[PDB]
Design a protein around this ligand. Structure first.
Ligand SMILES: *[C@@H]1O[C@H](CO[C@@H]2O[C@@H](C)[C@@H](O)[C@@H](O)[C@@H]2O)[C@@H](O[C@@H]2O[C@H](CO)[C@@H](O)[C@H](O)[C@H]2NC(C)=O)[C@H](O)[C@H]1NC(C)=O
Ligand SMILES: *[C@@H]1O[C@H](CO[C@@H]2O[C@@H](C)[C@@H](O)[C@@H](O)[C@@H]2O)[C@@H](O[C@@H]2O[C@H](CO)[C@@H](O)[C@H](O)[C@H]2NC(C)=O)[C@H](O)[C@H]1NC(C)=O
Ligand SMILES: COc1cc(-c2cc3c(c(=O)o2)C[C@]2(O)[C@@]4(C)C(=O)C=CC(C)(C)[C@]4(O)CC[C@@]2(C)O3)cc(OC)c1OC
Ligand SMILES: COc1cc(-c2cc3c(c(=O)o2)C[C@]2(O)[C@@]4(C)C(=O)C=CC(C)(C)[C@]4(O)CC[C@@]2(C)O3)cc(OC)c1OC
Ligand SMILES: *[C@@H]1O[C@H](CO)[C@@H](O)[C@H](O)[C@H]1NC(C)=O
Lengths: 530, 535
């Protein structure tokens, strides 16, 4: 019996499992319950701490995936399947995972906490691409990831009601962060050095914890990869949340908030999932039905407001984007797009594409998008229209919200590091026209290229090793830099410096699409207010 | 008596003068009356045709400059004085000039008609820079130029009223063109080949003649240099013109505000010309640049609709047009009103001076509109760089007032049947006295088009003399054939079209072909901004 795989936490005793990497073993504790199962009367309610157990919890395998919609746009295709649930779906899904060096560290090790993305409607901590073994072995951190409720289960809100208050998936995350404070020491972790990191909705989540005081006490540094709490998709107001909750009830045949939630509770989970997409008010890309709601509670104001009025002295943040943030989303709703052709759209498709990509704005607002994003010397050229519409969607949803966050944070006391990730994985199965799509930096941050049984090049392995070193340096010190030799300077609102991450050494550049983001961040809001 | 210097026109007999030019003699008939003097009771009224006379009128020197404001921002400075009146001011100013080859052409010769600019408030055909002797000598065309009333005398309007209907300066121009039809043959000119050309307000006037059918019969081709009838400075609506007329009258004590139009006008008629002139600048609604008090008025008469609407709805088959701009359209205007600007320093403005300059440069738009301008003209990697800010303000003013209106005109004329040629004039004259930062300012191609560098007393380089010869050639080729190209191995000037948008650079190097008249910038001014102003 291996004593390194026995741990006792506040609720009871756990048995882990030893895992192999090419660098040596690692200890993992997978499927640790951190909340009571949010089932039956508990659906839509905030999570309750897991009651203590007798005996030994088997923590040797990933637990169930939270109920969520499963992608079937390209059945069997690696590019979609790698994001899909790889364990059975269940509402009993509130488990977290801890990876630690082997043998377990005997002194306080810095903790990385991963929050997965997936539009707040999908994702799982068990996905291969989020495997913590390589980071833990190579950089000697403790790594934690949790499942949190997604879709209606995590974000359906009838604001004001006690039966469906909203933001419960965010409370799932907070609760797991509380669990880490109380229990990570038992694994060698140091509860006083917890770095949060997340991608997409995960990054939006990280930012939300930054802006919510009951969460802010539970971690020390933050990494936001291709996502921001101020993204136009990342939150909804109370009115639109109520409307969507109400449209979901009617689609599944339910009728007073109390009677409405009670009827929703009688419905099989899969039935709610089968109607995921149907509650959005208009045809769109990069929009998700059930997202965090601004109701004065978890967020006391909009993240934009909270960001502008925050003092961020004492915070270090790492943020960044991939080279082609918009491309992936176009195959899921823009007319004329497919992974299976060059998606060389027409001017008319570009224009209908803009209405989809910037949903719910006035025609004047759309015209201003079209103006900014048309090359008026080549207004009708298919390849430029494809790149331009990718830019529209990527800038609006990701790049410019991230730039805004970085600018405000740096100007209000935080030390910010920014990157653009510009390497297209040799193993990437999405077409070449998609460039470096959303999500495709992650396998490199987790050092997945070190897995022998996969097809990455020798250069790609070395690259993954650089990136794990940046991320872990940042977790340990608040600064990604290695000792002097090409340096990664902090991002400031004036100089606006960021680095390109690819196979070549660090290259410093200026401005996160400064001209485009001026439009989205400075001009467009004024237009929308008049 | 010299038979060449004697000519009979419908009105009576004329005696002209024989001018020396470095390439040979030219016959000039300067100061031909074409209207009854718009004096006294005829102030603000449409021009009356000149009554026949007995005997011989001496057309031997330029007549008076029409009453106008005189610039004193830099007294004695060559750059300003070259534009100022060089004859005495008078309301008695409706004279035109004809230059013809000596000996007089035997067969009918194509005619160029010049229309000066100066914001509809200033200018004269007598200026040295508009001397037609060199064009006529080099290219054997007939050149005509006319005076027309400017300022309140030309464009004060109380719309609807008989006593000050507005647009009489444009009617002055039209009467001159009728005179050309009736009389230019007597000088050896061809009334069936008449090409108008003008710069700034003159270019805008040319465009208005295109858009107004009774004018349209009087010429065949048009050249618009750095101006367009659709420019935001070039017309006002009836209400704004009335407001301005009324504030002028009020500033000079008429009536002893508003009232009977007949009475208001009669009171204005008793004021000395100079009294009106002194208050001219004072009626503009806000502090501004590139704005002028009394300009053509859209009243349904001369212009049946806005020039914008007429350009859009018009059929321009059978028409050739040549249009263009200088390299730095906006710079000149900035020293006449934008904070931080001077000809006597580098005008390296602050960001705050830039924002304030935007309000002045784009007057009478919403705050949101101004914000859109700041967004499109700020470099967000260098938002406070003084040199860049100076340049960008120059571009705001140049694009908004000149480049974008001309591009829109060119695109619409091309799309709708006209052969269009477009240019950008990029040579900065060796003799230019304005500071280096202004680059190639508004108005500084004219001296080259008119061949002024051939004038021995002036100190242009030999290359500039060659350049001027090339330019005169294109203009004359265009006037003769509707096509500036040489009827060889010489680089070709391609038509401008709404899709390819090709134009040429004019300078010391040969023709270089380029695409887009500030196409990105102009999409903002011509496509987006108007939609924003509506909403
Ligand atoms: C590129 O493909 C899109 C999408 O098409 C799907 O995948 C293709 C490879 C092929 O199997 C199509 O038949 C599929 O629909 C094409 O867009 C579609 O055009 C059809 C009509 O021709 C229309 O009914 C669909 O709605 C369109 N799909 C979308 C997403 O708008 C597009 O034309 C292809 N581009 C080419 C051929 O250049
Ligand atoms: C550039 O000049 C302008 C305008 O000024 C004139 O010419 C200068 C060469 C110098 O002799 C000035 O004193 C002249 O007035 C400067 O702007 C002016 O500043 C004065 C007071 O200093 C103020 O009353 C005026 O309103 C300003 N004029 C404006 C705003 O148009 C400008 O500061 C000069 N730039 C420099 C010195 O860098
Ligand atoms: C099939 O039905 C539909 C599916 C989608 C749909 C699916 C979708 C996304 C998206 O934006 O829209 C983005 C996405 O979620 C990612 C790209 C994402 O957001 C972030 C990260 C990863 C994991 C890479 C992802 O979840 C991977 C899975 C993705 C592509 O799946 C949209 C629809 O409306 C147009 C729709 O029909 C109404
Ligand atoms: C001194 O009083 C003022 C004068 C002006 C003023 C003067 C002026 C112009 C102009 O845009 O505004 C442009 C101008 O006319 C030209 C550049 C032009 O338009 C076209 C061609 C030429 C001949 C070169 C010009 O007429 C030459 C004379 C110019 C420079 O003179 C503006 C004022 O308001 C800010 C003002 O104060 C109320
Ligand atoms: C203005 O006054 C004159 C008298 O001097 C008169 O003949 C004319 O009809 C009046 N017009 C109007 C509109 O009152």
């Amino acid at each position: 019996e291996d004593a390194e795989l026995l741990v006792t936490v506040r609720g009871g005793r756990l048995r882990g499992i030893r895992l192999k990497t090419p660098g040596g073993p690692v200890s993992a504790f997978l499927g640790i319950p951190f909340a009571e199962p949010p089932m039956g009367p508990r659906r839509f309610l905030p999570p309750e701490p897991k009651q203590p157990w007798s005996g030994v919890v088997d923590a040797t395998t990933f637990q169930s995936v939270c109920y969520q919609y499963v992608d079937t746009l390209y059945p069997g295709f690696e590019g979609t399947e790698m994001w899909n649930p790889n364990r059975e779906l269940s509402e009993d899904c509130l488990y977290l995972n801890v990876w630690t060096p082997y043998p377990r560290p005997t002194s306080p090790t810095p903790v990385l906490v991963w929050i997965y993305g997936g539009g707040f409607y999908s994702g799982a901590s068990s996905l291969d691409v989020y495997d913590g073994r390589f980071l833990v072995q190579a950089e000697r951190t403790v790594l934690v990831s949790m499942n949190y409720r997604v879709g209606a289960f995590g974000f359906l809100a009838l604001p004001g009601s006690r039966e469906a208050p909203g933001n419960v998936g965010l409370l799932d995350q907070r609760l797991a962060l509380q669990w880490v404070q109380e229990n990570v020491a038992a694994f060698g972790g140091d509860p006083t050095s917890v770095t949060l990191f997340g991608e997409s909705a995960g990054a939006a989540s990280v930012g939300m914890h930054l802006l919510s005081p009951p969460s802010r006490g539970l971690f020390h540094r933050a990494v936001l990869q291709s996502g921001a709490p101020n993204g136009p998709w990342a939150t909804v107001g109370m009115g639109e949340a109520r409307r969507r909750a109400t449209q979901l009830a009617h689609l599944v045949g339910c009728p007073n908030d109390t009677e409405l939630v009670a009827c929703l509770r009688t419905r099989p989970a899969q039935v709610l999932v089968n109607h995921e997409w149907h509650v959005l008010p208009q045809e769109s890309v990069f929009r998700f039905s059930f997202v965090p709601v601004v109701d004065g509670d978890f967020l006391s104001d909009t993240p934009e407001a909270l960001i502008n009025a925050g003092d961020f002295h004492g915070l270090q943040v790492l943020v960044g984007v991939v080279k082609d943030e918009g491309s992936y989303f176009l195959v899921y709703g823009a007319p004329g797009f497919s992974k299976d052709n060059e998606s060389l759209i027409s001017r008319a498709e570009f224009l209908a594409g803009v209405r989809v990509g910037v949903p719910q704005v006035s025609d004047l607002a759309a015209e201003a998008v079209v103006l900014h994003y048309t090359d008026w010397l080549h207004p009708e050229d298919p390849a430029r229209l494809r790149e331009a519409l990718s830019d529209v969607v990527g800038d609006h949803n990701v790049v410019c919200p991230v730039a805004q966050l970085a600018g405000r944070l740096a100007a209000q006391g935080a030390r910010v590091y920014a990157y653009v990730f510009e390497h297209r994985a040799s193993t990437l199965s999405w077409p070449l026209w998609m460039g470096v799509p959303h999500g495709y930096e992650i396998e490199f941050i987790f050092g997945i290229p070190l897995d022998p049984s996969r097809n990455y090049t020798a250069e790609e392995k070395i690259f993954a090793q650089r990136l794990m070193r940046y991320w872990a340096n940042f977790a340990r010190t608040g600064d990604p830099n290695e000792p002097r030799d090409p340096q990664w300077p902090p991002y400031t609102a004036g100089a606006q410096q960021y680095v390109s991450l690819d196979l070549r050494p660090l290259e410093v550049r200026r401005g996160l699409r400064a001209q485009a983001c001026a439009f989205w961040n400075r001009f467009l809001p004024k237009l929308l207010s008049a």
